[PDB]
Enzyme design. Structure first.
Site, mmCIF file in Angstrom:
data_model
loop_
_atom_site.group_PDB
_atom_site.id
_atom_site.type_symbol
_atom_site.label_atom_id
_atom_site.label_comp_id
_atom_site.label_asym_id
_atom_site.label_seq_id
_atom_site.Cartn_x
_atom_site.Cartn_y
_atom_site.Cartn_z
ATOM 1 C CG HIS A 65 -4.111 1.906 3.615
ATOM 2 N ND1 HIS A 65 -4.880 0.835 3.195
ATOM 3 C CD2 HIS A 65 -3.125 1.383 4.392
ATOM 4 C CE1 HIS A 65 -4.367 -0.280 3.682
ATOM 5 N NE2 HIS A 65 -3.321 0.026 4.434
ATOM 6 N NE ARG B 214 1.699 0.839 9.294
ATOM 7 C CZ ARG B 214 1.203 2.080 9.226
ATOM 8 N NH1 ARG B 214 1.988 3.111 8.915
ATOM 9 N NH2 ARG B 214 -0.097 2.292 9.435
ATOM 10 C CG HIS C 180 -8.049 3.572 1.437
ATOM 11 N ND1 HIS C 180 -7.566 2.706 2.387
ATOM 12 C CD2 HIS C 180 -9.221 4.035 1.916
ATOM 13 C CE1 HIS C 180 -8.394 2.658 3.411
ATOM 14 N NE2 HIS C 180 -9.426 3.428 3.130
ATOM 15 C CG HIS D 204 -8.726 -1.484 2.646
ATOM 16 N ND1 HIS D 204 -7.515 -1.039 2.163
ATOM 17 C CD2 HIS D 204 -8.724 -2.829 2.502
ATOM 18 C CE1 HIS D 204 -6.828 -2.065 1.694
ATOM 19 N NE2 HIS D 204 -7.531 -3.170 1.916
ATOM 20 C CG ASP E 123 -6.802 0.579 -0.583
ATOM 21 O OD1 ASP E 123 -5.974 0.696 0.356
ATOM 22 O OD2 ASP E 123 -8.027 0.708 -0.399
ATOM 23 C CG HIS F 8 0.832 3.302 4.643
ATOM 24 N ND1 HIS F 8 0.210 2.985 5.841
ATOM 25 C CD2 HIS F 8 0.990 2.127 3.980
ATOM 26 C CE1 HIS F 8 -0.006 1.680 5.894
ATOM 27 N NE2 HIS F 8 0.459 1.137 4.773
ATOM 28 C CG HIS G 136 0.970 -3.984 5.276
ATOM 29 N ND1 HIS G 136 0.597 -3.424 6.485
ATOM 30 C CD2 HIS G 136 0.949 -2.978 4.369
ATOM 31 C CE1 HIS G 136 0.378 -2.124 6.320
ATOM 32 N NE2 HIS G 136 0.601 -1.828 5.045
ATOM 33 C CG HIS H 280 -1.698 -1.161 1.480
ATOM 34 N ND1 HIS H 280 -1.525 -1.953 2.578
ATOM 35 C CD2 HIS H 280 -2.640 -1.770 0.721
ATOM 36 C CE1 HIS H 280 -2.341 -2.994 2.510
ATOM 37 N NE2 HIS H 280 -3.032 -2.908 1.385
HETATM 38 ZN ZN LIG Z 1 -6.606 0.947 2.112
#
Ligand SMILES: [Zn+2]
Ligand SMILES: CC(C)NC[C@H](O)c1ccc(O)c(O)c1
Ligand SMILES: [Zn+2]
Lengths: 154, 154
Positions: B64, B144, B81, B72, B84, B49, B121, B47
């Site tokens: 995100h 993370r 997002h 999400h 995403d 962020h 992740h 993702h």
């Molecule tokens: Zn997201």
């Protein structure tokens, strides 16, 4: 758009730091402040370089950020790179306390430095007044000690 | 007018890699590719962020990147997002040869991800289909493992 940014400086040696950027008006100056440690006492060139590319360490950051194709100068000169932020000063403990205001860099538009690299250098920047080819390009500030990508901050 | 970006992902564990971004046309998709090692075999949430802030490691990247305040989703969903990008897949050696094309992230404008943080992740992203509160925020992708600020590239 962005009004705050932040850069974590790291290298192959002991030089480490965190620099903050703030620009409350898009057409106003940027405050640049924070601290750098692990430096030899004295002056060190402090520049925004063109690429936020750390794939080969500080070397892949490329040259001083210079979108107007000028010659290298100090941050107070009209003739300067957008990236030319002058010298920081390390005390006897190797700590440089950075407190700068600058009207040429921006956190938005064509001079925007988000996504580019901040670099602290081995030697003093001669501010483009050293009387050689190198002085007009890099300020003779020499080696790159630490760098980081300038990122958007909360 | 950036058309290329790069991100060096690093963490406190074995996870590291380099991710490239290319967007030849500002109204076009962004191609995302590269290699990340050190990952457990199978799916890992991937993702962008919001903050390019690595002062506290990956935690300071914030949530995100979500400038439209949506829930999400997966990258093929309209409800997602901006950041995403879905999952990347690591093979039996722990290597994810990432290859994504996405038309919601951009390297310019409102959805610009330059100066933001790419994070890989711990777990699979459930693409917002997990039916719990966390699914609608993070996809349950968990901690993370490695991150870096997305920088402008040559
Ligand atoms: Zn997201
Ligand atoms: C970094 O030295 C590191 C490498 C491999 C690992 O498994 C780890 O936890 C940490
Ligand atoms: Zn310069």
């Amino acid at each position: 758009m962005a009004t705050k940014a932040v850069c974590v400086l790291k290298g192959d040696g002991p030089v480490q730091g965190i620099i903050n950027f703030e620009q409350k008006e898009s057409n106003g100056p940027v405050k640049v402040w924070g601290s750098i440690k692990g430096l030899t006492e004295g002056l060190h060139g402090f520049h925004v370089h063109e690429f936020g590319d750390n794939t080969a360490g500080c070397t892949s950051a490329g040259p001083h950020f210079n979108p107007l194709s000028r010659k290298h100068g100090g941050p107070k000169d009209e003739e300067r790179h957008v990236g030319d932020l002058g010298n920081v000063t390390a005390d006897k403990d190797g700590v440089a306390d950075v407190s700068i205001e600058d009207s040429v860099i921006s956190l938005s538009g064509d001079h925007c430095i988000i996504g580019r690299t901040l670099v602290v250098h081995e030697k003093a920047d001669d501010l483009g007044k050293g009387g050689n080819e190198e002085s007009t390009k890099t300020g003779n500030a020499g080696s790159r000690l630490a760098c980081g990508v300038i990122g958007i901050a909360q």
